[PDB]
Design a protein around this nucleic acid. Sequence first.
RNA 1: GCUUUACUGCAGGCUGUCGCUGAG
RNA 2: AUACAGGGUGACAACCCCGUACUCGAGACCAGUACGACGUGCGGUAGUGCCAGAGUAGCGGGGGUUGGAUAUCCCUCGCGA
RNA 3: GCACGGAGGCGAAGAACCAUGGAUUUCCGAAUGAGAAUCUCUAACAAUUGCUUCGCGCAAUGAGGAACCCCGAGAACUGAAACAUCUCAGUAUCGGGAGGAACAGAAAACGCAAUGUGAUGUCGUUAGUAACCGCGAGUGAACGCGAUACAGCCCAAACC
Lengths: 81, 46, 65, 56, 194
Amino acid sequence: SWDVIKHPHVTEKAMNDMDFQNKLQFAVDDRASKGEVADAVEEQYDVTVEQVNTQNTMDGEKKAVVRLSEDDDAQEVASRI
Amino acid sequence: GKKSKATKKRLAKLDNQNSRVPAWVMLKTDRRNHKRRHWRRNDTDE
Amino acid sequence: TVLHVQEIRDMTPAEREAELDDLKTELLNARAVQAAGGAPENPGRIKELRKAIARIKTIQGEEGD
Amino acid sequence: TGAGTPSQGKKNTTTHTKCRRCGEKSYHTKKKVCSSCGFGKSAKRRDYEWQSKAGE
Amino acid sequence: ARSAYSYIRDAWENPGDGQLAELQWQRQQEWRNEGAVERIERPTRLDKARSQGYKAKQGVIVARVSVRKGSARKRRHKAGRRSKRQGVTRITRRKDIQRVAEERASRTFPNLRVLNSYSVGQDGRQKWHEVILIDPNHPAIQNDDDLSWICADDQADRVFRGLTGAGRRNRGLSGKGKGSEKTRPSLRSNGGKA
RNA sequence: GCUUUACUGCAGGCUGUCGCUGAG
RNA sequence: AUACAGGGUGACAACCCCGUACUCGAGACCAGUACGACGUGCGGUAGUGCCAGAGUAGCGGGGGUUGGAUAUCCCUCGCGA
RNA sequence: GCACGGAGGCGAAGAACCAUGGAUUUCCGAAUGAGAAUCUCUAACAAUUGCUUCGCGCAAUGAGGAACCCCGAGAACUGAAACAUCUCAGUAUCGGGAGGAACAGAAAACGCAAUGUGAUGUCGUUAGUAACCGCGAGUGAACGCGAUACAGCCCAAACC
Ligand SMILES: [Cl-]
Ligand SMILES: [Cl-]
Ligand SMILES: [K+]
Ligand SMILES: [Mg+2]
Ligand SMILES: [Mg+2]
Ligand SMILES: [Mg+2]
Ligand SMILES: [Mg+2]
Ligand SMILES: [Mg+2]
Ligand SMILES: [Mg+2]
Ligand SMILES: [Mg+2]
Ligand SMILES: [Mg+2]
Ligand SMILES: [Mg+2]
Ligand SMILES: [Mg+2]
Ligand code: NA
Ligand code: NA
Ligand code: NA
Ligand code: NA
Ligand code: NA
Ligand code: NA
Ligand code: NA
Ligand code: NA
Ligand code: NA
Ligand code: NA
Ligand code: NA
Ligand code: NA
Ligand code: NA
Ligand SMILES: [Sr+2]
Ligand SMILES: [Sr+2]
Ligand SMILES: [Sr+2]
Ligand SMILES: [Sr+2]
Ligand SMILES: [Sr+2]
Ligand SMILES: [Sr+2]
Ligand SMILES: [Sr+2]
Ligand SMILES: [Sr+2]
Ligand SMILES: [Sr+2]
Ligand SMILES: [Sr+2]
């Protein structure tokens, strides 16, 4: 059984999305839909997901850009792992 | 052109394979990626 | 290592599952630290976690859960 | 217009592609038939005795 | 005393005379309107079917098959040939029509195996044969002392390998002595000269 | 490769005959 | 030494190491066979024209094939006990 | 692991390794819910069959395998110092199909003609003999014998 979240995608561009737009980025299973990514993320870090954007990368993986609600602080979440 | 999801997966794999033999493999074997490819000089499949 | 087959069998179906999630998480966090290029690693565990999970998963099928 | 070099420039059509069944780049995307394994043409695998010397 | 069967038998010795003549005249009209392979509930020549192995039992199937009459439907040579290999009109095939019929029947019923077949007439442009097929997977047959032999693995697709009565005769295996030097044990092993 | 009233054959067409095919 | 086959080991090794002879063990195949046992019941006399496989046996036209020659095997059209 | 690194870890809770059995076993693939260059779209034995509880409920088929094997389709170069019958050759190649081997096989046989043999393969021989053939070039058995291995049975019908 394949899991949805593979690991946090951590790069300069990712940090910005995290500090400036309350967004977290993840490497996810390319079979996962935007909705399955939101659900998975909410149940792993207990937060509210507002929007999810996806991209099948040239690394053969899928990258997801998850924006959290104003109640959650991306920086703090990312900092506990 | 327009690539499908599968095509893209295959292209990505080709990009990954197209890398150096790690330095440690050299030491461990005490002394060449024979499949090194160039986008221009070579031609992939499909 | 730290987790043995005997111990795994001594758990109830509910404990193996709870243990399975606890393991998957440690692994996920390891892979997260690896993604961040973090060095507080211990490569042995990342390897051990995978095995432990296969073991619990193997036991779960053997026992019927 | 020559049949050689000048006519080689008009070639930008894709025909043979990676085959789903055998993996070779022989699946003709226009005919939808693999010239290597016969996929799209037959359930059996394309094969011929002339692919080797008669007594072998 | 004579069996009722002997009467069906005796009728079919002269399919062109008596009641049988009129029956055929009627039947063929309907047969010409049917397909290439029509499964039928009961054999048309009961005596013949029972004689060949047929039984009124689960797993025993009968089908009528029609084939175009005449010689080979051969395509003329497109490349060079010496006079000898240019013929096209008088060349006939090596398998008789009954055999071609058994094979079409067996293809229609992939899971069944041909037991035997017999002729049920012809008109000016086609021939009809009925074929007895057996279900080697049905227990009514796996438990039959007279038919269970056809359930063995090596009997699979028997018709396509010439193992039928019609197959064996067409292969020249009737005679046990003179004339069978190149037919037995197989046409192939004898270099294909029989 | 090509030609033709070269040799020998093969398709194809025409024609008779038998089967399909019956009653007065 | 019932072991002087072969190999390895910083150079020509029976005796340095693996093995090698002897002896022993297991699996596969032979084979669900052979043997054994259960059941079934072989055979003979007299009478009885009750039964015993049809487009068959066989013949002819046309082909192919064969060493098959008049005397191979098969296909096809027609006739047919 | 190959693989002679670095770091770290596992092993007396007996790891590595080996044997046997089991677990897991993505997608395409006969590929089977429909479609597609390995992905997608909205519960599926698709298709052909048998049985049938007539419901895909129970089942079969499909594709693979080095060659070997069986049934069909079937060349030409070549030889004949040309070439047409013949030859190369039922070879190459093609279609279909089975198995661990296939096929054959218990006489409407043989015909060393007999007061004789006694299912069938195969091996040796019979023999380049008989037979064929622009009677040219060439093609070419069988019965028998010596071996190998041996094994004989079941229906249809009569009478029920
Ligand atoms: Cl069959
Ligand atoms: Cl004798
Ligand atoms: K020739
Ligand atoms: Mg997008
Ligand atoms: Mg790069
Ligand atoms: Mg009986
Ligand atoms: Mg010839
Ligand atoms: Mg599919
Ligand atoms: Mg010549
Ligand atoms: Mg043989
Ligand atoms: Mg001459
Ligand atoms: Mg010859
Ligand atoms: Mg003889
Ligand atoms: Na990755
Ligand atoms: Na290129
Ligand atoms: Na069949
Ligand atoms: Na020329
Ligand atoms: Na012949
Ligand atoms: Na004839
Ligand atoms: Na496996
Ligand atoms: Na099926
Ligand atoms: Na059904
Ligand atoms: Na010559
Ligand atoms: Na010449
Ligand atoms: Na000749
Ligand atoms: Na003698
Ligand atoms: Sr990259
Ligand atoms: Sr170029
Ligand atoms: Sr022009
Ligand atoms: Sr130009
Ligand atoms: Sr173009
Ligand atoms: Sr097609
Ligand atoms: Sr083939
Ligand atoms: Sr089959
Ligand atoms: Sr008889
Ligand atoms: Sr014997």
